[PDB]
């Protein structure tokens, strides 16, 4: 495979129209009308109004999508 | 090298109470009404009524859940 190894990364778009990325994730979950995600920094994030849309293991990218379209 | 990236694996539960797995996946996608997933064999799969529930990077397990709970 590739010349080195890393954990996955998350990417999302806010209701503000801005974007956020989270590197070195240990886990991601769709739960309670939100996405939760946890890192090797012992930090945990939460993003309401999202769901897990795509997982691309060729590059380790996890793309989130808005669960509402209104 | 030594050390290199490796593919995830998917798990899901059927309406019969049995379970199904897909090993060494290149990609997984959700479309709200279904999940779809592709392997290193150039073989692709589809599962209506599911969505992506979690991605656990500690083990490489992707787990699917039912898109309605009613």
Q: CB of A40 within 8 A of CB of A23?
A: no
- Strand B8-13, strand A19-31: pairing: unpaired
DSSP B14-43: -TTS-EEEEEEEEEEEE-SSEEEEEETTS-
Mutate to test the interface with A, among B1, B5, B36, B51 (most CBs of A within 10 A): B5
CA distances from A21 to A9, A30, B49, B57, B64 (A): 7, 17, 29, 17, 23
Q: CB of B55 within 8 A of CB of A55?
A: yes
Q: Nearest chain A residue to B9 by CA: give it.
A: A57
* CA angle A49–B44–B62, rounded 5-degree value: 45
Phi and psi angles of residue A68, each rounded to the nearest 5 degrees, phi first? -100, 150
Tokens 């998350």, residue?
A: A10
- Flag whether residue A54 sits within 8 Å of chain B, measured between CB atoms: yes
Q: Find residues 10-49 of chain A whose CB sits inside 8 Å of chain B.
A: 25-30
Q: Where are the domains of chain A?
A: 1-70
Q: CB of A13 within 8 A of CB of A30?
A: no
Tokens 């994730």, residue?
A: A25
Residues in chain A closer than 8 A to B22 (CB atoms): none
Q: Which of B1, B51, B55 sits opposite A27 (nearest CB)?
A: B55
């Amino acid at each position: 495979g590739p010349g080195s190894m890393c954990m996955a990364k998350v990417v999302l778009t806010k209701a503000d129209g801005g974007r956020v990325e989270i590197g070195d994730v240990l886990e991601v979950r769709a739960e309670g009308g939100a996405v939760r995600v946890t890192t090797l920094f012992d930090e945990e994030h939460a993003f309401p109004g999202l769901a897990i849309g795509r997982v691309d293991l060729r590059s380790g990218v996890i793309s989130l999508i808005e669960e509402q379209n209104r």
